């Protein structure tokens, strides 16, 4: 018996995946979030882990599925797995913006239910709660939210806002930490109601679904819409996400910068764009003027 004979498909898969193992699980675990700041990690697609200065851990739209695996729409997942859901331990809330496939995940739910404390709430619109209960998440552990609702999870004020009786289907979140606010728009198309939120709230960092729409499809925000969003929200930082995940939606985030450069002076834009990378951290307000993220290079 040699390596060539003993190894099978499953032995390879189960020793290789997820790609990052629990590296980021540990990174988030040991991250000390300074006062007057908040830290966040891009988990792929619209997945965001949020950590407040008080050590509060919040997880939004964390998705661990894949696209097509066979020929038996050619959406192929182009983002690796930067966070193992089954390595999560310290978490204080599990959120979903809407019930679309790649925003809510049974495996994430399964992991939290098996490994984490029983007082972790699952927060989302009715349709997401219906979907969670179906997977076996206890009723009493789910908080249904509508636009207008505010949910206090430790030191994080979660503001449920309008997405675009649809209150049952989708919501946007505004996370208010003692160090800054974060806007998560899920997979919303651009809407004028972004302006409402900008007038009614102080928004620091804002995330919006960027992506290259295939011919005859309007599923993602364009580079021009990302800018309109930042302006409407009166944000300081505008970060594209969702553009990472789907082969057919492969987009160039640099378009947001190039357009921003043409328009910022003329329109008096009060924000900067920021190109992130999946698995990457962001600290507000430290990283607000960085423009472009880079992974840790050296060994410092």
């Amino acid at each position: 018996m040699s390596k060539v004979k003993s190894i099978t498909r499953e032995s390879w898969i189960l020793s290789t995946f997820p790609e990052w193992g629990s590296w980021l699980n540990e990174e988030i675990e040991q991250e000390q979030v300074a006062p007057g700041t908040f830290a966040m990690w891009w988990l792929g697609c619209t997945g965001i882990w949020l950590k407040s200065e008080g050590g509060t851990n919040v997880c939004v739209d964390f998705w661990c599925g894949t696209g097509k695996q066979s020929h038996g729409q050619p959406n192929l997942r182009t983002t690796p797995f930067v966070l193992d859901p089954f390595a999560i331990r310290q978490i204080d809330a599990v959120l979903a913006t809407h019930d679309h496939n790649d925003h809510i995940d049974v495996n994430v739910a399964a992991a939290v239910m098996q490994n984490c404390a029983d007082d972790v709430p699952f927060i989302g619109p009715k349709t997401c709660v219906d979907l969670w209960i179906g997977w076996g998440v206890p009723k009493e552990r789910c908080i249904v939210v509508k636009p207008g609702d505010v949910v206090k999870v430790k030191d994080i004020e979660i503001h449920a806002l309008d997405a675009f009786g649809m209150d049952d289907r989708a919501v946007n979140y505004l996370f208010k930490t003692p160090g800054g606010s974060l806007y998560h728009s899920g997979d919303s198309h651009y809407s004028n109601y972004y302006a409402k939120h900008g007038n009614e709230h102080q928004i620091d960092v804002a995330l919006g679904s960027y992506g290259e729409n295939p011919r005859g499809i309007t599923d993602k925000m364009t580079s021009a819409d990302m800018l309109r969003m930042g302006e409407a929200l009166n944000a300081k930082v505008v970060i594209p996400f969702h553009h990472d995940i789907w082969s057919n939606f492969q987009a160039d985030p640099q378009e947001i910068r190039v357009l921003w450069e043409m328009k910022k002076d003329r329109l008096k834009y009060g924000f900067k764009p920021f190109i992130w990378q999946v698995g990457g951290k962001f600290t507000w307000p430290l990283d607000k003027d960085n423009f472009e993220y880079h992974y840790p290079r050296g060994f410092d």
Copy 2:
């Protein structure tokens, strides 16, 4: 009974990975490479699948491992798995450029041995055939190659050339197909010997290890070196690779284009750059003026 009880870490992994399942395996199998052309797929890192007009399938530097998975170099794999090694059926040759971790793989060796024909050769330098034998690959089924050697796998003429003692450890490949030619530089630094190869051979498409070097390290070629490689090799297309794989080497391939734009006319560059994406197909010479690859949009 309920899914938040029946699902385990293990079942989730066995359900989700590799991310593309067998889509690319099936696409490569289905591909009808037209005469006068060759087809090519990027499999992450320096991993290339090549299919000639005569349907000859060749796999170079196919790597199916990962980077760091725990805290106790911060190299994290940033590329998903686009090809299932254990789904490979039709293959004519498995090749490796060198014995470094990122270019040779035990599971790929295992897969080809279990799933494919018994006459499929494992081609690489002495150090590479050693590891293959050590893993369980037959001694006689391996072909040891050094610079100067020429191996003919059906209609593909494989030229083992100089890489950058050394002769036992690393080689560059020039795959001459009837449709065209491909230069696989492995993980070589820039060398003046590229000019020797460009003189002595017709090179159509050239691949070079691109990446953003950390402060105090020279491990990957720069954007300027990519263009110098294209010139020295007298190539018609210059494609970066390797920059996809490691987080800490995350580079911008657009630097190649911008510099090309500045230098092309002055220096009479005979080539064009191409920015590829992992799992993507490239067809010489149909895609030579494309500049940037996009995935099928459906």
Copy 3:
């Protein structure tokens, strides 16, 4: 006797306006449209004059109103386009069209000019809500042809196709004008929709006009630069031309965004069209001008 005493506001206005007088009227009237080509003029806002190789004259969305003229939301709605064409100097005309009932697309004075100065058989083509506006003004109901998405109207060698318009049926229509020279898509003031792709599959489109502009914070009324590119892709056009961005002060946009994005996208997305930055009063000739990228007014020396 002296000018500072004789000249009045009325005498100045009537001596100066409209700015181009009947220059463009004259130019259109004597333009010899070659066989295999069609020629068109931009009349401001969404207003287009089309002339086929058989000399058929069609007028779409020709607006001759203005913005705000005083301070007494109070929109900073100010017209930033001069009047390139005198409606009352129109003689040769075979059809008068309107995409929708909105202020910027339908005009009383244009209607009056065709009834006073033009043939008694010139059709007023438009949606149900537009003909009700025409008739109410004094247009004979027998002149009007009420069109619906799917309707086709033959005006000599110009084959007019009424198509779907976009907002959130009786209110609005898009137009496709097929000529022995080529086709022209007129989206009016439509938002971007997936149904552009329908039109691109069902018909061949050569030149596509898109309502472009800079949306005020919290408004969505004009298409973005990225939308203009998606529109040209969906319609399988060869030329994409912005319009409507000229007319309103508060919607002042830079058409160069379209080109800059196009340069970034063209190869990766394999666009089969080129953008074209036009100027009001300007003439386009398909396909002579398809690769020009930018229009320039006659320099004349």
Copy 4:
């Protein structure tokens, strides 16, 4: 009678024009120019309305004419700018100015409206050749101040400096307006000259306006983008604004040409000024807007 039958060409014109009506007139009337600042409006072509902190109104090169209105130097020059200001709605004014007697810089109707609607002590300031043209139109002799280079005219709190122009002291002048808020350089329609350096050395110039345009093949009547930058340097200005490029179809130009060259040269040449791309009817305020780079009209909509 119906609307279609009753409405004539005349009635359409009477209610439609000028395009902006009296909107800008009212904006200028109500504008409370803050101390330490000055406000100015681009009236089209080289037309500038200037309002000091002390409420002094000054109108320079106001042209309410048009180009070719028919086919009939055979020149296809068509007015590409709408009318932003009604001259007949002007009520509060302290002085009417003209740089030179050229067609696009002096207007019979502007003189007529001012003579009819404004106080009889309002001066008409310009070179000899301009006052000759004004006198002929019916403007009294008593109401004109003839200026040659070197002359200084005090109009309330605005020191107006008639400086050298570039093709005769009788024909053309450049103005430097000194307000308590800042200084404004109006070069009229001068081609680039070396004598801008003299003015730059001898005077503190804040905002410089230069006649920009795309010259037709074999004609040299307007400044290039490169000329625009050399002016700002020579004048030692802080802001450099192109004008005159708005008005003529055949002279249609891209102002961004000035910005792009500036981005190539600013560091190497150590430029102390910034370019600013303005729009007709738009207000500029010194020094508040000096760094804005590009103007946009009020976008409105707060709901």
Copy 5:
């Protein structure tokens, strides 16, 4: 006497200068100009060496002086090396000058021709130029005084003397008509409307104009924008800046011409391309008409 004692300033100078020696002298002499073409070299400043397919050698504005060499009114230093040795000139068929100004007519060059070359080589220039040549010692019998309108035939090259704009006694412009194509040399002229007159009455292939960064309150050179206007007026196919090489205080960026051309070419339907040359370099019309930028031979 050792080397640190035997070496003098004068011995070093004679051992080093001119920098290029006779390298370019040798290349011009050995140049096989193919039929239907013409080859030209940039000798520094406005110095042009023309060679027709019939082997005819013409030399325009070849200057071999230098700028300021001490402090005891502009600080003009020569920033160009010497690429051609005037005293190595063998084959020549004409010597031309555009105007009296020092940077365009040379004593040492005139001398070198009178000593090394044929006794029937004409010295063609305006009235003021021949006055200097005669004064220096060139026979009145070998000087062709040209006015705008005059046309001198030198073998297969046809020299058209046209109006200058830097006065018919003082300066002229040249249009060199060869079988292979025409070359417009504008000397040190600034932009003028009379450029259009030359474009209408002749076909211009390559146009050379005096480019430079004008010092504050100085107008002595053409701007990048003026170079394009010249190209348009002359109806050229290739526009090449020169003169911008020679003076420290006039140092300019020829890339301005390219950048502006990129913005304007389509809108103004330019029928020419700009071309950035280097001193000592070779241009071959029409082979190099689409090269945009010259590079020196890299060898090997």
Copy 6:
């Protein structure tokens, strides 16, 4: 007897050259370096004149040879005029060389210093460099032979000899010039190396010089535009300046590549430096000119 026959080739050469005369010599000598600052001049190739606040004068790699002067492996032609006259040098404190190659050491410079300058002026360089100096007749006692690690004090300037890159300790060293006003890295003709990071950590480096150039096909002899930026990061400089690209026609490169690449990477890589494009004969004042990006000759 007139000018056309009295003038010889020697008459022209000895009156015209060196191009700048003693213009730069005078500027250097009259230059009053302010406290907290240092001034330097680019003498062509890798030649640098350096002047501290105390008035010390250091001459590094000053070359006065030239390229090919006739056709009788490469077409290397000097594209730079001579900006300094070695024989006009009076006030000097030290003469330095980085390595023994032709382009970096000159006998005429040695001779001029030996004949015209003080007796106690040391010739500092690697072992092979002092061999050539001794071989040219410079006293053995007057030469300081250096290897990596050695530190030589010259008035207020502390010269640090460091490693050069292709032992090599015989042939080549790199210099760090510590002045009371700031430090200067002179990499000489080194290829890119990781040991730039070593020097970066050990020393504070303010201004960095690197041998930029356009390598011909199949030759790696000069640093690329990307290498220049990498050097800046490794040395942790605040100013990165290309040189050596000026001197050979073969290696004609555009230093703007450094800037363009810098504009793309600076924010992503948190570059703590700026590129500065110099001109031969130009002055640089650290820290006055640190933010300039591009030098221009005095326009006057």
